[PDB]
Amino acid sequence: CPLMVKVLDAVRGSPAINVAVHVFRKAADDTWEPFASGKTSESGELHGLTTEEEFVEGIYKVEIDTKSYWKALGISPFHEHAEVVFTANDSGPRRYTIAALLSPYSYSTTAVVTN
Amino acid sequence: CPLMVKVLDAVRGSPAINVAVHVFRKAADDTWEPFASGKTSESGELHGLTTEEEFVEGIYKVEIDTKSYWKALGISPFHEHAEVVFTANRYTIAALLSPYSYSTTAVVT
Amino acid sequence: CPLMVKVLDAVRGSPAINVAVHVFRKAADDTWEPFASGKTSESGELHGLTTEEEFVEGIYKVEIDTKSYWKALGISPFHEHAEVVFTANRYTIAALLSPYSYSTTAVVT
Amino acid sequence: CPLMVKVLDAVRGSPAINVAVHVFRKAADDTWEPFASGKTSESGELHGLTTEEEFVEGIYKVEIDTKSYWKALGISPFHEHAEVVFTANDSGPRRYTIAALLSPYSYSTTAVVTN
Numbered sequence A, D: 001c002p003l004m005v006k007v008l009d010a011v012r013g014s015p016a017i018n019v020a021v022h023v024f025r026k027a028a029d030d031t032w033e034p035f036a037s038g039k040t041s042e043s044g045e046l047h048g049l050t051t052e053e054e055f056v057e058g059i060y061k062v063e064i065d066t067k068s069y070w071k072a073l074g075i076s077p078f079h080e081h082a083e084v085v086f087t088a089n090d091s092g093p094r095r096y097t098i099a100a101l102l103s104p105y106s107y108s109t110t111a112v113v114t115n
Numbered sequence B, C: 001c002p003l004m005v006k007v008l009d010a011v012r013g014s015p016a017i018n019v020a021v022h023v024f025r026k027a028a029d030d031t032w033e034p035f036a037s038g039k040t041s042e043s044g045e046l047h048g049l050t051t052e053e054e055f056v057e058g059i060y061k062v063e064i065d066t067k068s069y070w071k072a073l074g075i076s077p078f079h080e081h082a083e084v085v086f087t088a089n090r091y092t093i094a095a096l097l098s099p100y101s102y103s104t105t106a107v108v109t
């Protein structure tokens, strides 16, 4: 599994469950094409987005729909969403985990990149 | 000054200086229109982006060119940039930068 | 002012006001001795902890009473406090607070 | 496994491997007693610190030896270590993951607490 997303909730100390995630890939003509989407599980994880074959070199945008998450919990947050934009697989294939930690007026994002 | 940006470097424990910042406002047709831009100062701060008059309610995007910042230091970064997207309904957008990670917070006072 | 502390609230997007901060210096016998203390201001800042004269090289501990802060808001927090331990060899110790998480950074200029 | 520690490296985008972790428990007389210790694996994780039976109610300090980690990589970091101090199991037993994200002049810590 070459692209995984993990989301945690810094207010509740829990995984962030059922968070919508949209992934896009920058096309030849510089527009963002829909690549893959899904939502985080009970463990705050989203797997199965893509395959090794499909996940070619490119610039990818991972959009985490944080606003809808916080709104469902009764919190009016600051951000519309958390976007993570990165070049992937430009010196051959890697496995990426995009991790986000969410608070209503703040988020943090890191990537763990392995061979 | 209703909107300011502050950027810090988590590797060096310093302001992140001369970092390009571009701000956009969402247009009626769902396009991002150029609003304001600047480079962070010696103190890692960017002031004077806009005025209370022009900073009306709307959806805004603040894009921080983190890649160029790391590249000028000879450090390979993960992200293409750091984007902060919010509805304006004083705003300080702060970002703390590492090569493979960033945090962003809004202080609204 | 060689040492200042700044605390922000990540739930409200605001300075964290009236937060108790205690600073200690490590003694020769490996004990923590009381050095300086204060409460954060309306801007979430604590200045005037010490002087250049007294702020000599050594190991320092900055303890931020985050538990009391959340408790006064009716929010059950995870941590007892936030501790920052460093060797002093201007220092701004910043902390960004959530109920189950905090981040701390040092800006040294 | 009721107490786990996970450590990531924000400079390299990798788990933080072989990081020393010391856990203490506040004793009756207000001193910190050695509870458990170990070091993070190739995945940046430390498991097997304690058992359900031993991990009673109390105030625990988890000390992550970040300075030694950064020094081994040629970086002179700001902090001596990252300390996480918390009351555990005070409304019955829980499972705790203490997560840290490390940069030379900054760290972040969150806890994920489950039943």
Ligand SMILES: O=C(O)c1cc(-c2ccc(F)cc2F)ccc1O
Pocket: A006, A008, A099, A100, A101, A108, A109, A110, D006, D097, D099, D100, D101, D108, D109, D110, D112
């Ligand atoms: O599985 C993980 O890698 C994980 C990670 C975090 C976390 C903590 C701090 C941070 F800045 C980002 C994170 F994704 C919090 C909890 C967690 O379980």
Ligand SMILES: O=C(O)c1cc(-c2ccc(F)cc2F)ccc1O
Pocket: B006, B008, B094, B095, B096, B103, B104, B105, C006, C092, C094, C095, C096, C103, C104, C105, C106, C107
């Ligand atoms: O001026 C400020 O508001 C400031 C802020 C930080 C900081 C710390 C942690 C974090 F997640 C984000 C930040 F921008 C670090 C240092 C700092 O001076």
